[PDB]
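HOLO CASE FILE
Compound: iron/sulfur cluster
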Amino acid sequence: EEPRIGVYVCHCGVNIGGTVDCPDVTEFAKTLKNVVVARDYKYMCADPGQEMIKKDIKEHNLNRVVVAACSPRLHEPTFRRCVAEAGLNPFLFEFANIREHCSWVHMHEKEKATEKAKDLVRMAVAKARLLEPLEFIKVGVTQRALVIGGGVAGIQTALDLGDMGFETILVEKTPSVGGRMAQLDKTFPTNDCSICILAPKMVDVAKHPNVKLYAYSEVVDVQGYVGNFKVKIMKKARYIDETKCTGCGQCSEVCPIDVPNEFDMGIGMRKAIYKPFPQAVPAKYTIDKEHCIECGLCAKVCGPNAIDFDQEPEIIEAEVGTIICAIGYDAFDPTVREEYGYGVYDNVVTALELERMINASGPTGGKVIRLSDGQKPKRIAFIQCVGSRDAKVGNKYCSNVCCMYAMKNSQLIKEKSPDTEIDIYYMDIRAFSKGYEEFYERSAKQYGIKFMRGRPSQVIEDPETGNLVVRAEDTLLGEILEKEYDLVVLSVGMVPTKSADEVQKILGISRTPDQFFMEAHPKLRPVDTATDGVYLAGACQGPKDIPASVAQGSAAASRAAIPLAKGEVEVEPIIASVDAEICGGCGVCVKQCPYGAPRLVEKDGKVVAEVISALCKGCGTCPAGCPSGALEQDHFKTIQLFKQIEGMFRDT
Amino acid sequence: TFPTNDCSICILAPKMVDVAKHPNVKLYAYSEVVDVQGYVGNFKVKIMKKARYIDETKCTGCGQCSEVCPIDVPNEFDMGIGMRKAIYKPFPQAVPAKYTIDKEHCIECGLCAKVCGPNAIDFDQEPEIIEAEVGTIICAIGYDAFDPTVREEYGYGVYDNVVTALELERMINASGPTGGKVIRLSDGQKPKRIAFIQCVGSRDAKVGNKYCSNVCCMYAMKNSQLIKEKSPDTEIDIYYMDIRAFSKGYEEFYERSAKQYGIKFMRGRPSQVIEDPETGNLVVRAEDTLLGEILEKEYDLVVLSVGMVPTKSADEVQKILGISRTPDQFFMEAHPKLRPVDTATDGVYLAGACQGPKDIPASVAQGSAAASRA
Amino acid sequence: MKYAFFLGCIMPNRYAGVEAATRTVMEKLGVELVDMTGASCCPAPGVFGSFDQKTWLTLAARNLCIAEEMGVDIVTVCNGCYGSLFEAAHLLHDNKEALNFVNEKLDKVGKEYKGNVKVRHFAELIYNDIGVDKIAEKVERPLNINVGVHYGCHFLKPTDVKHLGSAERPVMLDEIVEATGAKSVPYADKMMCCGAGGGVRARELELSLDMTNEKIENMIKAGADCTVNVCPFCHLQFDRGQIEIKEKFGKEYNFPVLHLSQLLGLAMGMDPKDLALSVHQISVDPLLKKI
Amino acid sequence: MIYSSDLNKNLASQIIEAGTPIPGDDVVSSLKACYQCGTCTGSCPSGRRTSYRTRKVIRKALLGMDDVLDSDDIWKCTTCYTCYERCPRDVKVTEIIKTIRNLAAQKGNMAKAHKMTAMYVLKYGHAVPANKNTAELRKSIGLSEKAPIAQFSEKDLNEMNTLIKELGFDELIGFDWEKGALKE
Amino acid sequence: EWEPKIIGFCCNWCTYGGADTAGVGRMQYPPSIRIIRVMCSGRIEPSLILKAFKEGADGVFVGGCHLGDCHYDSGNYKWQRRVMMLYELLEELGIEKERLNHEWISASEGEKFQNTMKDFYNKIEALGPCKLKEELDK
Amino acid sequence: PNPEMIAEVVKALLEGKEPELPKKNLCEECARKKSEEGVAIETIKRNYEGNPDPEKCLLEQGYICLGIATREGCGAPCPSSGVPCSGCSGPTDAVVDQGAKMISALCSDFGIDNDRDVDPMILPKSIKDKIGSFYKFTLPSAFVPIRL
Ligand SMILES: Cc1cc2nc3c(=O)[nH]c(=O)nc-3n(C[C@H](O)[C@H](O)[C@H](O)COP(=O)(O)OP(=O)(O)OC[C@H]3O[C@@H](n4cnc5c(N)ncnc54)[C@H](O)[C@@H]3O)c2cc1C
Ligand SMILES: Cc1cc2nc3c(=O)[nH]c(=O)nc-3n(C[C@H](O)[C@H](O)[C@H](O)COP(=O)(O)OP(=O)(O)OC[C@H]3O[C@@H](n4cnc5c(N)ncnc54)[C@H](O)[C@@H]3O)c2cc1C
Ligand code: SF4
Ligand code: SF4
Ligand code: SF4
Ligand code: SF4
Ligand code: SF4
Ligand code: SF4
Ligand code: SF4
Ligand code: SF4
Ligand code: SF4
Ligand code: SF4
Ligand code: SF4
Ligand code: SF4
Ligand code: SF4
Ligand SMILES: O=S(=O)(O)CCS
Ligand code: FES
Ligand SMILES: [Fe+3]
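Model generated. Tokens follow.
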């Protein structure tokens, strides 16, 4: 069939038209072979612009459509649906970018920008001629979800999916669910205990009939695609029989080895046989073989005889349709900002360490005390933006919660000890959500918390008393302050969790400049990823608070429930396929695919390569590496790309 | 839309198109819920399909009957800057694409009917009451921009060159009343110097709004970049207390506004705005708190970064659904952390700005969260 | 090791003993110091960088060309010259617009900078290329005294281009002075400025002396017997500045001042007469009695 | 009271143009990234004994206060680079101060001692030239009586003079070649 | 009187987005380049670059994700091995190595893309036109 | 061309039929055993280096064999005789530039078992005559058929 092309040059009001001479590009498009219709319009994506294409496809019997406008990353689906509504296959549509790639970057070179637009149109027309009609691959959806991370965000996703009636698997790396919320004493702006909201949810998710909780477990492998994922979960050995364990803790009172409690940020001491925190779920114990001396003293007091040192980790193979990543975050390590002396001075602590100190079930019994002498501080200084809004540490983002938790912990210290003097050293107070500004007003008006606008230059310790001096300019007075404190609290920012690299490779997802996980689109798909069937929820997607992490958990459940509810999903046909008549089975393609789609097989008594269509993601690496030309990626065939290259210099 | 500066309608329009032709979604535009009875899983709702007084099916959406209409109504879509007729279309990319007659300002002269070919115009059209049974309800009625007339020292409604940020959005918008040109309302000239005044109607006990409107720091910086892109010679100063660029790519957007676009920031909430009656230029009186000196800089246009308030119909919807409000006057969620999109009324949920001031991704995430919960 | 020895101004024309001390110390360490004939002022960034940046870089590149024509790299014992020539070389290598502007000016005098010159500070050269172990091997007279080490500012900063490690908690000079048998005593605000830099000594003398006085006080409180620097500018400020502090504020310390080269020379059995300690404004005799 | 008429709106851009291409457009344009945190002021050794506030100098530049070029404060910076090392917004503070001083010098705000220093380099090629006592000292120490520097090389002195005239540095400091001295 | 003809090959996930970012931020750069879109840089092979030079390209640019950040996990590692061989093959054919430029640019790196376009344009402008097409047309 | 192919083409034209050439690459006709896991190259050797195994694919052994980028029909007498294919029959109908495609394939499989860590400079450094290795019989038909 001979190509009948319709070329549409968008003006985008004046965004394109103001730099590129669109009428002249339209005249030039008409001189190209196979171009039957060429028109220029103010807004091609608008109703009149879309109806103009549909009417021409019918009235001029077009079999190809070229739109010279903005980016396919913005309107490729839009124009695909538009042409499909007129009966034209969506893979016979080609987009030429003359806005972001031309009019917006060559504003002072109008003549050259117009000639560039003509070449970009000729390149689009060149590829268009050889485009072919393609059909989407329909695949089934396994009615089961997987949630990675058992924090407030992950728990919310699993509870919502479970409540909807979908089988869900919740994998938690540590022995207990709850996450960082469990480490906090209170939570802003209601000043409720973190337990108030979290514990009931932890209890609910642990006994939910549609949620299978795998605590102290990790996802070690994920294979497949949307609706057809094959996952491997490694159930780490706790060395205790969970079904026989009571969780009384008679064992902990006999263990003679002391290990620093990771839950208390090293500020607390736990035993080899431990329970993360008193409200932990599952209420079971765990033996750390890295520090266990295997004396067997805990086994003598254990009544049900659950302790078993011969326990081996179990690999559980599970099939899921959608995956939700809710692995959270880690607190920034402030050792790098050496002027503040963290890791050098005993009385310089992080805010997460203060949470453990203030917490009633913490290592200090809920008492804020100096680590140098065990005394309670009379003067405390909070230093904001530690590890955030700072190019020197490579973190040029706002960690979102540090203004609010500093004010919250200050209110909590004032409640326990009103005589305490508290100063907060800040740049901007970010109390941006519901009841936050009011919480900020309350901190100053009711609790007498003081605010000093000035980012401290350095902290100096008195080696003799352990007291610290904060050097900072009070920018609102234009004077340098050198106030002394008994304790300095660094309001550390958020960073991706240490395991984020492992999870990224397993799920095949991307990261944004802040190093957190990349959402499909900031505005319209905040919990989806560009990888179909993989979603995000909580702090692992970016620094945010509990209300936002809970809402994201619910948002992810809804989005991950769409493919499950549908029971069938479509996959892009821009995949690789082997021409059996040309392939002599050289085997070069096999190892190039990271998903193992291309496979060697026997057909008609001889060896030939064959691609498992569902496994192809459409990168185009194996067809580029095929030495016989038998392997080709539909929509990015070598002949198609060759014509596109020719199109820059000449027609056809 | 910040922080990507993507065309708002160019990215929202596809979703408007999708929802209008979705096989499982029945769209009742130009309609209002007038009654809700029952309880969770057994709600009996009454929807009033308002009469456009134009035949829906025979309506082409060309717009030739408006030219003859003699009544000029201020266009709500253009925030009062523009003038529309009694017979109209909200915006060029509207979904569904059809015209409407506003009987609150219609004089029934019949001049539009003489020009109309299809004779779609029918004043005897009657609103239809649709009875529907639903199991769950999601309230997503949004918000309204704060009216800054109350803060009289700023002179909004008195001075011609004092505008709100939502009015500026329309002036900047290509499909707006000025054709995408930022111009002074006193003489139609482009302003060479612009001042943005933050927290107007927010973080203010005098107007009864002691909350942060959440999006004003970001939209002021965004619109300042859009003006610099259109006219780099323009001088732009932002009068603030705290720059709240708290989410992903926001702090970077703030850094970029200053470093790349040369947008200036003045830490100090202005005391008042004084107009020069001879030129229409405005003087902003404010203390530069970072210098401890009083500034009295002159500008060609003053933009008030107005906060968010509940929408005008919120009272009607509250009574119909039987839901509560929080101190900020927005709708009350069951719990700020245990249930951000649920209400204490079973089967009734919230989503978007009607629950509290927030940006697009937060509203979109709440929309998805409400779908899951409902 | 062969290096074009950049002298500067203060060392070769005022504190000449620092030159003599460097010449023998570097010879003992196996470094061939070749004369950089016709080398002028770096020029001093304090006045030239502050007066006209174009002039500072053009004149700095002119000096770099001298060493480039010799086909060898540069070495210096002055933080001011190090900072000036090093930042000039970096800027010419990283910025082509700056290189074009400077070469267009140097073409008038038949010169052209090609970017083959590396500027080195003798302290970091001794630390990274020779080794601190070689200092101890050449020690003839161990100097068992307490030293108030003054790194200066243009030695390690700016760290983004210098790449000599930490500027907040360095060990480089402390390990070099401790190799002579001395002890680097820790004092308050160890990394602070002497006050002489950026043309402050010449324009705001009292301001510069206030900062030097604080450094001297902190060193004396720490138990220091003397102060060591790697900058004839810091040297002048600490030495001549003590006379000014006595004439203006009335405070007398008589704190001996030494340039690392002179400290290494004493340690390597050099005759105090060849180090020109007599030309110092403050007597080094109390220190000579302790060693 | 500060009015629009007392401010020079292009001061920031003017400081950037004076820094292009030396020390660089990207280096001096960093003054626009300043978010007035005060870390530079708190780190300043000079600020601890004077009215000099590093942050206010950057503020005065961004706001357009003309007096910053006439002020004595910009000349109190010792160029210790501590603010440069600690700035969380990557502001090349020390380089911006030096570039502002260039505009100050063009306006005529140069100390006599700094100009005398600039004259010695133009006349003798050195900021601190050799005298009769230098020759005597170097002799007794065992060094060459006259160092191998530009001072004793007419070829190198004439090379510098050609560059200085081309750069316009002689006109900046106000040096008269015929009289062999500075004017004013 | 002459302007370089530069052809570009950019991956849809990172460099294509990086080029769009430069456009959204109105980051101006020379108009010599014409970009071709591929899904991954792994799609790029010697045949596409050599074909561009045959057609008259004065310079060829290729953009992909950062090493380790490929949307398709490792497509850019195969392209990296192919381009190193191609650089030396071009030199054997009398084509300056500098006429080929490959960079790793993300979707958020608009400023980097702008400077890469400026630097590559300046590099090719200085080299002058590639006389291959002229020699072949004789 | 083999004598039979010449007769087949001429005979088809005498009858009036359109002549048809074989379409696959040489590995089809080559009797050497291939790894089912796929092709993986550890090092690159020149034809005189080492002693080649007579059963295993020469490309997997580290020799530059053009068989993967060459049209079948010859009967693969070169690999059968103990030497790699030199690509004398030219490329298949789906490949324009044989050398470019051979280079693409070779680079892709070189160190594929250690893909992320293999040094991309070993291969270009190991081949001192690239044009002679990949364009022996097809340089004039290549995209860049001359040395400037
Ligand atoms: C000092 C401090 C105080 C704060 N105070 C408040 C406050 O008062 N109010 C408020 O709203 N917010 C506060 N925040 C923010 C709050 O902590 C977060 O909003 C919240 O914890 C985010 O929940 P999350 O589930 O997304 O992440 P997380 O709480 O970090 O949960 C992640 C979970 O995933 C698990 N996980 C990690 N890796 C893996 C893996 N590979 N496989 C399986 N599971 C894994 C983790 O063990 C963890 O249980 C504070 C933060 C800090 C640092
Ligand atoms: C000047 C300005 C600039 C901004 N810039 C940005 C930006 O750059 N980026 C960004 O992310 N956010 C920005 N925002 C915030 C953004 O506007 C909101 O996030 C967004 O509109 C929230 O959408 P919504 O659906 O919740 O409410 P809305 O957008 O207000 O929509 C509510 C809908 O409900 C309808 N409705 C109202 N009452 C009833 C009723 N009784 N019955 C039926 N329907 C009803 C309304 O007609 C309306 O269509 C800005 C806000 C302002 C004021
Ligand atoms: S198609 Fe693209 S360029 Fe044209 S109006 Fe729409 S967004 Fe603007
Ligand atoms: S292991 Fe035994 S002793 Fe320890 S808590 Fe479990 S049941 Fe009690
Ligand atoms: S056997 Fe292990 S867990 Fe039990 S008491 Fe001994 S060290 Fe502790
Ligand atoms: S939330 Fe507050 S303390 Fe935290 S990074 Fe942002 S401004 Fe700094
Ligand atoms: S690389 Fe090409 S010829 Fe070789 S097995 Fe794969 S499809 Fe067949
Ligand atoms: S084109 Fe990419 S994803 Fe598809 S089969 Fe080949 S290597 Fe695998
Ligand atoms: S009412 Fe009539 S004239 Fe107006 S848009 Fe509808 S069809 Fe057109
Ligand atoms: S009848 Fe109503 S809508 Fe029509 S022209 Fe008259 S006033 Fe306008
Ligand atoms: S977001 Fe910014 S402008 Fe808006 S109320 Fe809060 S602080 Fe004020
Ligand atoms: S440290 Fe940097 S951002 Fe902070 S005030 Fe000083 S120059 Fe500005
Ligand atoms: S460089 Fe200048 S302004 Fe900065 S800290 Fe040092 S003396 Fe102060
Ligand atoms: S030796 Fe050559 S022709 Fe034979 S299988 Fe190996 S690559 Fe193919
Ligand atoms: S070089 Fe020629 S004859 Fe030898 S195997 Fe290859 S194609 Fe056949
Ligand atoms: O005054 S200068 O900064 O040039 C030298 C001090 S090291
Ligand atoms: S997708 Fe960008 S290189 Fe693979
Ligand atoms: Fe659009």
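CASE NOTES: DSSP finds seven helices and 19 strands in chain B. The pocket of iron/sulfur cluster (ligand 6) is lined by residues A 384-385, 388-389, 398-403, 428, 430, 491, 493; B 246 (CB under 6 Å).
CLOSED: yes
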